[model samples]
Target: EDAELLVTVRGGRLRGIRLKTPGGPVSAFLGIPFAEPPMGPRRFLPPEPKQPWSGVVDATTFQSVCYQYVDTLYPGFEGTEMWNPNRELSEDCLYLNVWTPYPRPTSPTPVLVWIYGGGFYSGASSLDVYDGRFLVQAERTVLVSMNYRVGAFGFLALPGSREAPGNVGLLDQRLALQWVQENVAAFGGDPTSVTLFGESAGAASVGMHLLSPPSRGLFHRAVLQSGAPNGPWATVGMGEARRRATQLAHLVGCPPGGNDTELVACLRTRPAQVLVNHEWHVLPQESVFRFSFVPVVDGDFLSDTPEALINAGDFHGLQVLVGVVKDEGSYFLVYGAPGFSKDNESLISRAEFLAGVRVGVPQVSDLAAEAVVLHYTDWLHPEDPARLREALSDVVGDHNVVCPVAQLAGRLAAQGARVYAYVFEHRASTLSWPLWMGVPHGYEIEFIFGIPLDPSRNYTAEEKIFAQRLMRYWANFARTGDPNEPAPQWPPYTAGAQQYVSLDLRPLEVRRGLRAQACAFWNRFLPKLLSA
Candidate 1:
């Protein structure tokens, strides 16, 4: 097994590990460097190709996670944070992992490259929840996951500055995809048949790549779960990005308002934790609609907003799968509303709810805002604060995740791209939270990887069956660019039909136009606001 696990990629030879699984033995090459360390002078710059190594590099242990502040208070769930304090950290964290059932190549297999989602701030391929053994073994496809820098280090953009022009993290992802194109064939992967798939920020990244010129041929298919480049939190402008950078520099005791060279020099000298610790709130406020640091419309990586590019038909000719969970925005409410709870003391009044909605959608007119409030709030649960918060969650979820995804799918289909859409409605009983919360954002991750929702427990037979179905659907898409293969004929999402596959513990079924009224309302409302 040890001898069988050694494979040579572009830069060097890697000695991975073999693990036994129900399907077969899978070869996992963990912590393989795809790019040069973005440290010291290289910090904030686009990734450079990794230099060749001298000997067989040890790829058994997980790599250091990118520098990011842990926000345990947010997300409020037990293991939702996904950070492992025990692991090492660094700015040189541009490593990736790979899993393959047939490492020694009999036939080239379809590859699935996963990009983890953490609001463009925090995520690691090393997380147990993102383990690829199950997915690779079950799906019989080559799997890859990579780490890209986040927060200020990855996204601080300044106009006319060579030091940082923003979208460095996105560039990092592109480099990894390039790495796969060059080297995955050694691991029995057909580079041309690669599919890029991710949830949340990762999903947004995949969408942005579709619009990027450099990323045109990197992947042939993409699955954007619960996000798209048009999503509210995806991209910001050079002005806001610069402002956030200056603010973060000030918070870290750097000489603020100085020239780019001076300010970036000060920031570099400080420890990595200095930036990670005090920079989470660098932007004015954190919400689903805005992020402190994210990809920007840097003339190089992104020329304009995703909607503009897609409308102009500037996106890649690739197959797409886009979808969202039932309660995508409930995760935001867990940490967003200060006193939101089940008790009446934390009750949010109707006016307060309206005010919050206004802030989240600042461009909408009062009349439109009022209409939204009237539409969503009328269906509040039979409780006070919890009910109002749930209503707020629905509004936020649709605004930030569901509506944007649906809109992207529609546009992609309209532009003659093969597209599929889904709505994940299954609520896992294993969740610590109550069922009324619905399937909060990212709950599909547990089922997607076939991992236990809680590490302490085992999966029930029903959960296992459900996970197998999901793995099949995902792998089938990766293979043939169509998820409808063996059974439960899933339909394509046409511009007029708006068909969607509803995923749950019960039999998978295709539904036409999910949340048609709400999605249609948002489709009109958001554009009006953006154009305002």
Candidate 2:
């Protein structure tokens, strides 16, 4: 069947196909434009709304992706492995995908929007795993996945600069939500009821959304996986972060100052591959500037650290379900180790100023060294190298994720919004690495979308049951502010009650003590170490 669909945005005939699924003949409008491409003058600026079209345009395929500097977050990414759904890299890439259960709306279905993550460097809605067909079919929810600018194209900062201050990527997210709120009803979704969810940096970005002034009231309920709203949050306000950007510019044959207009002009006109291969990992002193894009805490899009904001009783009256996977630290252990390094002396020396930790010099039987190793090992099992690196992840997570999420929940519950916490525990067999990655990072993603990492293992009978429960838990919360409804009784989070849902082998159990412990550890450390 052929259905004619064209929006006023982006003049021309964009093609789309109305495909039939088991439930009904749903028009899966693949790539729809949300904004004008951010090339030329629009670069480093907020997303511009798409100009309306005069005739029926086709949206059969995704628009080309913006110039995303695909940082190999790990080793597997290459060739077809980096297959993104959007078009190729360009300056203009603000497209969104729509998966409607049906074109006609008998009733308003809940909406779920996904944002992909790659350390704010690389990611797009075009990934195979992000396919929302199963999600729409299974959950009976309309799904939207979008492509936003990434890396320098999305989030380069200049403190005293010419460009629009910071959080352009976040502003893009806000724009997408605004588009959805205005247009989702046409795609069979209740614009009033929307759930914003993502994993990793996307989840981290979702965290940013919670605090952004421009993002307020755009989305209702939110879900995060292996990432918490405030735990991994950072901005460009740090003198150190700004310095790293400046130093990288000088290394790449530009000026040494972070805000040099001449350097910005030179950097933008350079070839994409050269920019991607540029010595972006250089640091001022020892601070790493691996990715040219990072959020700026300019007191506008973000006021303070999520922790600081939460402590001040901000983020009130927002229903949230935030969580992390059991093996989140595993990603850091395997990936962050080489870049971040592991020498105790190096850590101590660096901490003297940069890290702000009072690390001690090592000896043959140094307890401090032993303590650090033991702390990392606890993220997984004993003597597991994969588990140890996750310690850094945990450190970041505890400061940036766990503590902040709970703090938000605590503050929100105090101010009368329902809040629930969860930790995804399913240890997938097909981690990016086949052999040693235990319950690793990004494992919870497939499970959320009803996709399996291992096609080999037909989900066990119990796993299938849990999958149903997982979808119900997520969907119920999206529909109404309750995960326990239509399933089991999951209580709102409270400081003393401290209830949290767990996902993994026992994918539907409630947890409590872990957050309390994490909160205690974090509260004592942040003031001195994190300076939050």
Candidate 3:
């Protein structure tokens, strides 16, 4: 055992393992506890700081992942399926893992912490997809990922009492950030220079941290890829949060209509796996994008909605990097809503299209819906029987993912917060998907993680080169605010120009007006149409 791999952080000393990579040797410390086990009396409560441990704690192996139940029917494509954490699951999973280049450096490195995505119902840092050795070895940045509580155990919102205050998952992440700030220096990383980034719900989580009061000064930069807190797919109001929590309790044999204290007490006695397996299903739109047990506006954790906070410029002092893939919603189409395409034709009828919109956005009036329909319908197709799957997918993308990124990036830029945005259109061949789903959500992750370098997968030489450039852009952004110096210029995003870099297999090109008209309708005209 090499004594050099050991580092002292909160609680006690941790012994890590080192791996050899092309860039350099990387030291990995897995399953470092950042909080007390949220089990037994601690169930449903905010994370308690992990107390000090005696002797050398062996941080060589991964610990059990959080208990979660992923909907098997909606399993995503080949790339997405790789995200499932195959290890044993448990409720006592409030750990964080760290990876940094081996061999002491003269100066401290930048920090890039990760928050995973599973629609707030699932996810753990142990998944093979999140192995940070390659990224850390190459970029020379210390990487850290945490295991936060998810689903009912993490986000059970009650009307009264502060015992279980909602958004404990976010709190779990906050505590981990504190751990990093307190101990990251021992790992040869700058405690003050942290870049918090993630994908999908993880992306939404980092965005929430940007607005959260307790999360301030924890990180200097953030990158939100393909998701944002303001998106409809990301959050549920208190009304919905309370409904689901009570429904879960009732489904689990706990008596309803009692005080939340009794309800939560009863829930604590039930088996953790049982709670994960028994999910309440109220499929209003049947949209695969819709998920249960997400973060709620508890009035305490959050004083108001993220949209209002963002519009009011109530955000942290940090630089931002945000973007979405080209066919973000297409992933939802193939795996989320199969009914939209009849007979496996992969086509959407005009009537089916309109119904889908209303189903997803029920608050919009008929007039506003019609306005959206006209703005999105393919004008070239004058035929009545035209199946408009592509148009419908774009509608879902603009409504759910793409437009939200645009709206948030625009707001941040307007508030004078430095922001850099982009659209990923390059499709990696390893995905084994049809071309119709060009660069679906989460596709950029493989490259961002430098997976092309992994000999297990078959990637072209050109693809590997592209991944190198892409990773540096991300890692570069994590180091300095700008993703530049070694290649194409990525200009700062501004509210007026609406410009963003277009990432494709071909050379990078800066483009202007990203779905401007459609986004205008969604963010500006559509809201007005509804209010009027």
Candidate 4:
């Protein structure tokens, strides 16, 4: 089974493996070092380039994932099959993997770089669902996936200190992008024509790169699957990050109110497993927007909030494609609290539901809250369990995922940026979720990768075709800005039009004004609430 292939990169030579596929032979370079290990003195610091190797490096096996808590539950409770834990992990995890159709193609090919999402606290490039073999072979394009630090190690920020200015994870990503820009040519990739893409926090990362001046020109095109920098869970303030750091320090037997220098020093000495073990039991009480550690408004990498930067027109002019699922809330709600069954109807009361929304978006006044209540509760009787479940799902979906995506699409399109929107509505027949789940978050991942986790599961002929279509669309977009080809011409999103390509089994229908009424309500009143 060993098909050895070699390629020389900036640091040294790498011997990758060759896999036979239906489309062609693909070379996979796994565990390629992109940055210095973020351990010891490097802990919580911005990533530095890796030291050059002396001889040929073996890139055949996947290196350890970044140290984080393993996620064993929530497989199908929502769209969490992809969030399953990695068997191996470690602190020395700043590595990347690449899948190319050729060791060096005759012509440079378009590249699709992936950033995995796990609330910015958990995720690994080693997940089988993220494997690039099928994608690279099917699309005739190069695929790359990289691992960055997450949780406390990656996003901890202290007030008025250079040691941990926060966003080291983002810096890690920027370094990887730079690595790609400098070395992807060796793997038969066009660095200038790269498409940076991801889902959820990963999608949010792509958006952050678009807005950050430091990340300009690193990527030519962007695809945000289910998030943007402006999404609710994407970022936090420096004060909040500081408080979290203090709290974490106190929990791990360090002085809670110590100076930044003392605190960071004590934290560095603590075992990595102790810190990671502390995170497993402490679940967030807040609903879906429950990441304790996230990107912050550091003076450098993030400068300001994503909305502020976007409004000020301080972003790159990259082609953008963004969208969300029909029921984005399903995955998140289940993730927050694992007590829900299909028949259960908790958090369905109008007052309780509005309270949760208000807590998440404290800016919404009573008037806007009442309007949401009236709009959703008018038709569905509160006493009916099934109706209440549906109502809550809609509100949660709109509040957290759907409307935010639409708002961003509107903003970017208004600025005359090339934008495309989509809503993945087709529930895979292969999935065994309840009918009410209605296409939960991250369902699109299986289709996009063309590698179903359950190989034994029966995949219908239409489902297989649909997967092919989705891969082609994403791959085509990576090649050209537009996701157009043999399937159908996907119209660019415009401020006035608000059109989106509805990716459904109904044969790829294009629709306009997705969730028109809810989005209008959010657009009209959310600013007032947030400002209040």
Candidate 5:
């Protein structure tokens, strides 16, 4: 088994390098460009092939992340301690990192490709939480983490870019998969046996990819954690997002009359911080709209709404895994900057805030707020104030998180795909946010990736065993098509039974009759919310 550092890739793009892991000699290549630098004129367009270079590009350091305004997009983001210390945002952000258990050509290892999530606006493959060392060890799989165009740069559809548009970020992901299919074998990965996995917006992207015509056969399996193929996963209409983009352009001194490329070039040059800052003010704070900016249903790349596509039985052949955290809203509420309405009477002062922006306040009375809180409690929680908080939890969670994913899973399962749903019930031992906020939105990510997580933010040693079991099951899905490897076999969801695996601090359990009652209740008013 003589394997040395070998540099053999098109454009001399990648070179083999060896590393010292716990298992002695291991090989890895970091920050390999799957596409050319997505900057300047390339901004907001489909990814282009990496320009072939002469010598081996350094495989040591990871690439810069796409530009993100931490203070503006997420004010208390850093305080939560979820920020990735490994990477930072930049315009030159179309690179990927790979780690192979063995670099030998004979090893046709399973491949797991990860897509990081930041509300379709932020995230990088270089993040610490996404590191795949342990999971690769446990499952003996080849791993890849990718950086895709996010926020406006990846998704904003304008006139000049309209033809090339809608889900450009998603298209970038597709290109990465295409790259894997063609080149992964050189790095010891099986091109035919790849599983695409993601959380939050990344999960949503995987869901949309499951439905997309362009995404067929790019990968064999998919894992979507705490996200769905609706809303922020797919664009409502790029026209609406474009209107917001137009206003944002004006905010940054770009006008509508000129050609879109010059405007896009000027925009590409503007500081990433500037665009991220404007995003908070211009984008809708509620889940109904701003999240819709990422994936659009333009009748081409995406023929119709993702929900419609799934309902139309588009992804019947795909093996799908979807799940949610215990208290998904905790992170948002903990990191949420108060909107001038800390008190009940002042809740109406929301009108003043809207007036400041020259938009009329929602006709929601304080009674309506009370009713909303009350309704959520009755449906998800019981007759307790804690229940009201739980309802508030589901208010954002159901509309933004759970229901959309359930819709996709349910529709696809009916059409024919082997859909498996799960509820992540792993409660954090040492909480990161305020005591009131339970296992926050991203609580399950560390466990899924096998990171030796902070005890304050994650599980104990024994609990981690269970977590490892869960990760093994996930990796097994990536290896095979189902979540069961040598571990306990988990069942797939059927239209009749609707069985889902509940990944708790213990072994997996079957959650019966999920999303039935919840989906019924949500369907009644969700159409109204979307229309409004």
Candidate 6:
């Protein structure tokens, strides 16, 4: 067992720990530095491959997370917010974790890589809830989660200098995937059979990889949970990226209006942690799940906009599982949307709801935004103020998560790619949010990670069974591109059928497109309106 726990990777020999799990034991390697600490002079540049260590490296402890702020959400829900994990936060956060169950099922197990989501500016793979132990036990697959730069450190886009090319965060992910292709074999993984999966921002990263040239062959399949590459919140244009750079420079007391060189020089002078402490905003409503910095279309990293890449069908063919929870919007409302927090009980006004619709469909004229209001209102009660919040939430969910999933799934299917889509409806049994909120964004994580398999969670027997089925579907998909060869019989999501699985605790109901009418409004009608 000692020898088994010790394996060699490109960086050096490393020692891992054997941990007990659902069925038996698994060897987990943590804090394996795949890239050199992006600190000091390397702070703003692309991720550099790690320098090899001399001896066996102690990889038992998890590494520090990238610099990011905890949401400090409305009380009680603070702990329930998207996780930043309890690990040390620092610039030296380019590390990865690996878990491989013992009693090998094959010479090389299917590899499942996780890229966490926090709007790409937050989240680390070290969170306890994202622990891949039971998932490894459940599927006998080698699991990998890597930490990449986020926030100012990773996504900061500066002009001119060779250093601050936009989207270094994505470049960091590129390096990590290459590391997987190079090193996963030592952990009993088949790099060629790799499947990449993530939630929200992580799922969006999976989509970015789809359109990225450097990431093409690094993976063979992908799972985009609650997100897509074409998401409005994920990829910002360099015009916006440059604007953010200026704002960040000004806030940090850097040469805000200076040439790109002096701007980069001044930014380097600020402390990494202090740099992130400075605030930024997005219009219409800054508190509404807005991301200040995100992947930018920097001609270099991204040859074109995600939409252009998607429309031209520039992406290669691979199996994709894309879906979202039923109430992806409620998470933002319950915690951060001003005046909409849990304790505030005033009925939402029509004006407030329309403002939310404006935020949901930003850049649209008041005319088109109002049209969106009409579209959804026609489908629901018009005057019931009590249901107003849910209606507004539906608008948010459609604009952000659900519609993006439909757009991407349709595009991939249209191109003859194997695409599976779904909408998770099970309200989290351990959730602290109101039941009416339904399953908010990122709520599907517990089941995906098999949290119910742990007794301390005190999950219902049905929930445990549900979690197992979810895990099986995911692991099976990673094991083979198709999720149901071994069905609930989930048919391949085709552009024609527009079908997807309605994943809930109830029987697997194959629904004919989630929110079909609303999605058409968002995907088909809204884009043309915005363009016009």
- What does candidate 1's lDDT look like per residue over 117-162, in tens digits? 8888888888877888888888888999999999877887775687
Per-residue C-alpha lDDT of model 4 across residues 188-254, encoded as one tens digit per residue: 8999899999998899899888888778778888899888788767888777778787778888977
Better of 2 and 4 by TM-score: 4
Q: Could you tell me how far off, in angstroms, the CA of residue 262 lies in candidate 3 after the best superposition?
A: 0.5
Off by over 4 Å in 1: 74-77, 81-86, 286-289, 314-317, 341-348, 362-368, 379-387, 452-456, 529-532
lDDT of each: 0.81, 0.63, 0.81, 0.78, 0.67, 0.81
Tens-place lDDT digits, model 3, residues 323-417:
99988877776554434431255665666677666655555667877887788776778233334677767877888888888899999998878
For residue 451, give model 1's deviation from the true position in Å: 1.7
Over 4 Å off, model 3: 74-77, 282-285, 314-317, 336-345, 379-387
Instruction: Give a tens-digit lDDT track for model 2, residues 50-147.
Output: 77776665677666776765544443543225434344777667888888775445799889989887667778887766767666766788888888
True-vs-predicted CA distance for residue 430, candidate 1, Å: 1.6
Clashes of 6: 1
By TM-score, is 3 or 4 better?
Answer: 3
Error of 6 at 21 (Å): 1.4
Model 5 misplaced regions, further than 4 Å: 1-4, 16-25, 71-79, 103-105, 159-166, 232-234, 256-262, 265-269, 284-293, 314-316, 335-374, 377-384, 453-459, 486-489, 528-532
The lDDT, on a scale of 0 to 1, for candidate 5 is: 0.67
- On TM-score, the leading prediction is 6
The alpha-carbon deviation from the true structure for residue 350 of candidate 1, after best TM-score superposition, in angstroms, is 2.4
lDDT score, candidate 1, position 134: 86
Model 1 residue 300 CA deviation (Å) reads 1.2
Q: Native-vs-model 1 lDDT?
A: 0.81
Q: Where is model 5 poorest over a 10-residue stretch in terms of lDDT?
A: 353-362
Q: For each candidate, what TM-score against the reference?
A: 0.93, 0.82, 0.94, 0.92, 0.86, 0.95
**lDDT: worst 10-residue window of model 4:** 336-345
